[PDB]
Amino acid sequence: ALWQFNGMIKCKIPSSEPLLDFNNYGCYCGLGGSGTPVDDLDRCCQTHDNCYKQAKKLDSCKVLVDNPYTNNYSYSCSNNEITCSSENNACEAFICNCDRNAAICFSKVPYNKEHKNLDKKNC
Template sequence: MMILCSVFFLLVLIFNTAHALSYLALWQFRNMIICNMPTSWPILSYEDYGCYCGLGGSGTPVDDLDRCCQVHDLCYGEALKLKSCRWLIDNPYTESYAYDCDKKAKKVTCKTKNGVCEMFICECDRKAAECFARSQYNKQYKRLPEVRCKQR
């Protein structure tokens, strides 16, 4: 019984830690977007935009901004294939990394002190944030009906 309680406690601890880290990883990505676009509201704007921004993704991107999200999703998929990115510990959705924001230049730099996995994920986020800054936001693609994104 004592072993069962210990295992349960450990699983709860791991889940809670991963959950907290996921917020940190999302917050870092959010801050990178704000570095490139200081007046933006990334979580409100890009969540559930087009076919790829937000959770999941399928079909053909509806515009350049949606394509940024598709490329970001694919980049995270490539990160998961790296040997240095262990599934539970160094997951792109939970991993934190080191970066700098030059607010004047509106430029993000991933720090060299990052490990291989952290650097790869940081670069995925940095490139996506820059892509967002270059792309036009089209309100008609917010909360797009799922049927528009089905593979054909």
């Protein structure tokens, strides 16, 4: 699963989408990439990955399905805010906090269109 993430960034920023702006940017935003960041926005993505790791260390996550990807959580948007099914257990709630915390950073940090599509040779 993944399309759910874009939704989190769509709620915080309805006037702009990630796949149509923050797509393939910095060395952490997007899906892969790696190495020194390029701006404050890239730092947010670099942290998104760090959150999926913390989720694996969690006990509940340790005995679930050894895979924070197939784990799809339910959520919703409203008042420029993200809504996540409270039923989400410890792991389900942590995975949502990771995607939600990522959309909040993009809206709290600036975005350089020039740093878009950076060269891994700089990372």
